[PDB]
């Protein structure tokens, strides 16, 4: 695997979400100026944001993480077993992950999204997923201006 | 390309939808016992069903096509330039397609979906897209029991 450390965690997170009836995308943009490492979508439309921190420095750089809260029902960190997990915010959910799997060790508290916002984000997720899929199946089949 | 004839049309349809800000999936299941060749999703949540008929016999077999109507805002046929297009229902939309591109030659009439149904179908589309994407990016990363 030539995946970067964050991509590795996200692979394991995605495997684990899928094993439990969720689906996911990577590098999702809920609003201008924000990007989340993994967005998970539950079978009833539950929205999870998972930030994959591959190092303490990676975590130090996500200082405005509380800004992700308004864009999800549940917010989680995902780190590997070498990460000092006790330093993460107590109120957050937590997964321990690697490139091959993940486990939730602390379930995030539920801060449900309003109906209109849930709609916008599901539409964005759909769009993200379907674009990336089409591009993998048909690499030449789009233009530079979209 | 080792794509079957219907898959070829669907490739061209998908390219063309994407060029105009739509996204798509293939072999979409809106309800038990139905499957549509291409589902298109518009940037405002418009739902299009496109049936890709590669032969007159293919069209003859889609006799219950009026059953697709309740699952979309707009219903289209997609055929190649060798197809006797005049034989298709007058009320339907029409694309002429091949493996490389497509064009709408007749815009389908709008029969808008109810809000609750639009939601269900967008959720299904999201789920379909994201599963297939994850499986292409990580072939081994799921189990046989989902
Ligand atoms: Na992705
Ligand atoms: Na990261
Ligand atoms: Na597909
Ligand atoms: Na077909």
TrEMBL record, chains A, B:
Pfam family, one: MmcB-like
InterPro entries linked to this entry: MmcB-like (IPR009394), Restrct_endonuc-II-like (IPR011335)
Protein name in UniProt: DNA repair protein MmcB-related protein
Lineage: Bacteria, Pseudomonadati, Pseudomonadota, Alphaproteobacteria, Rhodobacterales
């Amino acid at each position: 695997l030539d995946l970067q450390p964050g991509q590795r965690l996200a692979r394991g997170v995605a495997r684990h979400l899928r094993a439990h009836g969720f689906v996911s995308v990577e590098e999702f943009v809920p609003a201008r100026g924000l990007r989340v490492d993994v967005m998970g979508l539950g079978p009833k439309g539950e929205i999870w944001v998972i930030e994959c921190k591959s190092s303490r420095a990676d975590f130090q750089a996500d200082a405005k993480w509380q800004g992700y809260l308004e864009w999800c029902d549940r917010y989680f960190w995902a780190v590997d077993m070498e990460f000092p997990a006790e330093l993460l915010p107590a109120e957050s959910g937590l997964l321990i992950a690697d490139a091959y799997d993940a486990e939730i060790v602390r379930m995030a508290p539920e801060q449900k999204l309003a109906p209109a916002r849930r709609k916008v984000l599901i539409q964005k997720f759909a769009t993200h997923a379907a674009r990336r899929l089409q591009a993998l199946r048909d690499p030449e089949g789009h233009g530079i201006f979209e």
